[PDB]
Amino acid sequence: KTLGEVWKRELNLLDKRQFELYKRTDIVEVDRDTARRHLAEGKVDTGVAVSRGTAKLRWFHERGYVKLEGRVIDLGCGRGGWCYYAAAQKEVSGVKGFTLGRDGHEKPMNVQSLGWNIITFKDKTDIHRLEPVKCDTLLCDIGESSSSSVTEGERTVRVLDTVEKWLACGVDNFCVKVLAPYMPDVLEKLELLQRRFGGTVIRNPLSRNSTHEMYYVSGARSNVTFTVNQTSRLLMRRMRRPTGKVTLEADVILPIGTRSV
Numbered sequence: 001k002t003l004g005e006v007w008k009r010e011l012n013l014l015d016k017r018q019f020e021l022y023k024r025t026d027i028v029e030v031d032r033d034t035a036r037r038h039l040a041e042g043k044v045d046t047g048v049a050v051s052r053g054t055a056k057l058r059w060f061h062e063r064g065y066v067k068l069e070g071r072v073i074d075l076g077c078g079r080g081g082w083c084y085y086a087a088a089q090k091e092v093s094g095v096k097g098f099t100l101g102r103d104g105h106e107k108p109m110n111v112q113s114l115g116w117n118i119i120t121f122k123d124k125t126d127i128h129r130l131e132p133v134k135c136d137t138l139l140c141d142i143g144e145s146s147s148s149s150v151t152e153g154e155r156t157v158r159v160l161d162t163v164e165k166w167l168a169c170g171v172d173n174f175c176v177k178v179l180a181p182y183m184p185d186v187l188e189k190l191e192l193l194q195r196r197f198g199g200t201v202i203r204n205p206l207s208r209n210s211t212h213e214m215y216y217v218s219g220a221r222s223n224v225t226f227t228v229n230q231t232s233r234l235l236m237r238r239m240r241r242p243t244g245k246v247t248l249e250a251d252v253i254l255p256i257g258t259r260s261v
């Protein structure tokens, strides 16, 4: 029924070439070449990002969609791209990242970009069962894509359900991935969360067209259904005649070193 649900259905009908072209059509992409080479050779002091996630969070942060301050908690940190980005910001005092890091799930990577010493990584942790703790900035980048819209809806509502427990503790800032903002139950949960905690959902330009993910952030407030549909309209427009044309941009390079007294 929603424009987004139609989008998912049409997405699944695309042929191999069209899907490949479609996913990167008119999107922005950071050049990960140098970063990947450094990481692969064991370099930990060049300030390169451990994943594409660092650039994603930087985009939100640099334009006020989320302030990174004080005690930061990163649910589903994976390799740690968001933890390292937050750790390098002066306003941040500490970072706790939690992730599964098991059975194929990315484990935290160890590099020494600025503030690596203020991050405490913990793997083998299912954040749905992790007891909420008080923090100032809450981050969560969880949401596994599924060809089934019903399934993406279920996974998204589960993430928001868990995240609400943490926001309820009282947080100033947040940036939470919403896998399928186009699903009706999700739209309603977002409207309820907005009334309780404020914020709104924003589409990151670094996201590929093959996913409708948007992020629930604290730095702005807008009409949820309107903006989710604006993104649905954009995604459907790009599916008409995929060019695979991408805009390459410089990846994030952070300063290096420990943050000491």
Ligand SMILES: Nc1nc2c(ncn2[C@@H]2O[C@H](COP(=O)(O)OP(=O)(O)OP(=O)(O)OC[C@H]3O[C@@H](n4cnc5c(N)ncnc54)[C@H](O)[C@@H]3O)[C@@H](O)[C@H]2O)c(=O)[nH]1
Binding pocket: 011, 012, 013, 014, 015, 016, 019, 144, 145, 146, 147, 148, 210, 211
């Ligand atoms: N028409 C197509 N749609 C595709 C394809 N691969 C993915 N998708 C769609 O994009 C969505 C995002 O894909 P992404 O690779 O970024 O996320 P996942 O790694 O979690 O993909 P899954 O949703 O987990 O799918 C697993 C695999 O299943 C295959 N798959 C998934 N959907 C399809 C379809 N519709 N047609 C053909 N083959 C399909 C494909 O090889 C996928 O890699 C996915 O949920 C699908 O709705 C594809 O080859 N063709």
Ligand SMILES: Nc1ncnc2c1ncn2[C@@H]1O[C@H](CSCC[C@H](N)C(=O)O)[C@@H](O)[C@H]1O
Binding pocket: 050, 051, 052, 053, 054, 075, 076, 077, 078, 079, 080, 081, 082, 083, 098, 099, 100, 101, 105, 106, 125, 126, 127, 128, 141, 142, 143
């Ligand atoms: N229930 C759960 N508990 C903890 N971690 C989970 C989880 N479900 C998924 N994850 C992890 O969440 C991560 C999402 S990808 C996160 C990327 C990160 N923002 C970066 O910048 O690198 C994956 O590693 C996935 O394994």
